[PDB]
Amino acid sequence: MISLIAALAVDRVIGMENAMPWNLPADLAWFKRNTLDKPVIMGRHTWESIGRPLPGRKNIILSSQPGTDDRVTWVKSVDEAIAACGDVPEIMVIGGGRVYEQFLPKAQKLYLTHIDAEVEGDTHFPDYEPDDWESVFSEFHDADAQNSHSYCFEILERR
Ligand SMILES: Nc1nc2c(c(=O)[nH]1)N(C=O)[C@@H](CNc1ccc(C(=O)N[C@@H](CCC(=O)O)C(=O)O)cc1)CN2
Ligand SMILES: [Ca+2]
Ligand SMILES: [Cl-]
């Protein structure tokens, strides 16, 4: 089963963690908690931006180009990405935009972080409609000594 996990700035703008204007260690901890011990699928740009395989998870990179790092698994299609995961209960797709769009239709859950910050960007998470999803968990948090901005964690199930 496919799950998408993303951090959204205002107006659903998305980008690479290392380039966003916030510093939210609480969100990275949530991300870790929610992906640990699960396969993670990402596109090429996100892989390059993270730089090293995320430990404790199977890292899968979706790319039409040949692989350039033997430390991760490279696939060329959505179906191939899912076959390479094996029989696992949940597959975490971690973006970017195009990757989110290719898996959305198959996704059954969404783990989102809504961050209260305005960012200019050209890439946005795709629209999800109120009728197709149920918010099953939500948790609001204020900015603090370690977290630059306020954020809300949320879990949605396809309805
Ligand atoms: N919640 C959430 N989802 C997201 C992002 C995010 O920042 N937050 N990212 C884009 O905004 C993308 C993922 N980018 C990531 C970039 C770096 C790390 C990372 O270093 N995580 C370490 C945590 C240890 C540490 O805290 O340094 C890990 O998971 O092991 C994770 C995700 C997409 N999905
Ligand atoms: Ca940053
Ligand atoms: Cl990407």
From Swiss-Prot:
Coiled coil: none annotated. One of its GO terms (biological process) is dihydrofolate metabolic process. Gene3D superfamilies: Dihydrofolate Reductase, subunit A (3.40.430.10). InterPro entries: DHFR (IPR012259), DHFR-like_dom_sf (IPR024072), DHFR_CS (IPR017925), DHFR_dom (IPR001796). Changing L28R: In strain: B[RT500] isozyme 2. Pathway: Cofactor biosynthesis; tetrahydrofolate biosynthesis; 5,6,7,8-tetrahydrofolate from 7,8-dihydrofolate: step 1/1. Changing E154Q: In strain: 1810. The keyword Transferase does not apply. Its EC number is 1.5.1.3. The keyword rRNA-binding does not apply. NADP(+) binds at residues 7, 13-19, 45-46, 63-64, 76, 95-102. SUPFAM superfamilies: Dihydrofolate reductase-like. GO terms for molecular function: dihydrofolate reductase activity; dihydrofolic acid binding; folic acid binding; methotrexate binding; NADP binding; NADP+ binding; NADPH binding. Keywords: Antibiotic resistance, Methotrexate resistance, NADP, One-carbon metabolism, Oxidoreductase, Trimethoprim resistance. The strain K12 sequence is shown. Strain B [RT500] is resistant to 500 micrograms per milliliter of trimethoprim. Key enzyme in folate metabolism. Catalyzes an essential reaction for de novo glycine and purine synthesis, and for DNA precursor synthesis. This is Dihydrofolate reductase.
